[PDB]
């Protein structure tokens, strides 16, 4: 357990007990050390710290197995395909129409949401855990419903310079910005809200 930090290759930081998510794992000078958030707080995956109980509905902290994501791809709306696991790096969540499906990687394989699929230890892996997250709150500008019209930008959907997990939207130079699904971040290059936030929210930068 103390070793997880430099087993995945991971930055020191916060990352998700797969366990009981009113916890999580610090790494901290490489080391592993499983910590409590203070009652009345779990672990919120997106922000990598202890939040109040509201902002996580997928921590049921009064039960047994507090990890319920049995529901998410309702609870949070996300579209059809695979996704990451938000507590457990060796699991997948299928979403189909609005319908969850909790699944595994074979024994001794992790989920590389990268490429979609499951795949044997390598040498720095589990890298979905690996971002850094927004502010909460994001705190935009007064102003920022210029951002269509001052970059003259054509309309439909662009990034939000101000989030990863949120993106803009202008329409005949009117500007709005809206969160991505909880969990979700927004792909600059497809312009999608997906679930890579290694590759959206500056994990590539951190390792």
Wanted: charged content about 10%; hydrophobic content about 30%.
């Amino acid at each position: 357990a103390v070793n997880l930090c430099t087993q995945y290759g991971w930055p020191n930081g916060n990352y998700p007990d797969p366990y009981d998510c009113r916890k999580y794992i610090s790494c901290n000078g490489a080391v592993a050390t499983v910590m409590s958030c203070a009652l009345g707080t779990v672990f919120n995956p997106n922000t990598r710290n202890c939040d109040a109980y509201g902002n996580v509905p997928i921590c049921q902290y009064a039960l047994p197995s507090p990890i319920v994501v049995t529901n998410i791809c309702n609870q949070y709306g996300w579209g059809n395909g695979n996704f990451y696991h938000p507590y457990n790096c060796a699991e997948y969540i299928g979403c189909a129409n609005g319908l969850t499906t909790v699944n595994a990687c074979g024994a001794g394989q992790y989920y590389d949401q990268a490429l979609g699929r499951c795949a044997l230890a390598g040498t720095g892996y589990c890298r979905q855990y690996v971002f850094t997250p927004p502010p909460a709150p994001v705190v935009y500008p007064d102003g920022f419903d210029t951002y269509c019209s001052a970059n003259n930008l054509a309309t439909g959907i662009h990034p939000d310079p101000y989030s990863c997990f949120s993106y803009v939207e202008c329409t005949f130079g009117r500007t709005t910005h809206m969160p991505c699904p909880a969990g979700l971040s927004f792909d600059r290059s497809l312009l999608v809200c997906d679930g890579n936030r290694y590759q959206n929210c500056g994990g590539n930068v951190l390792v």
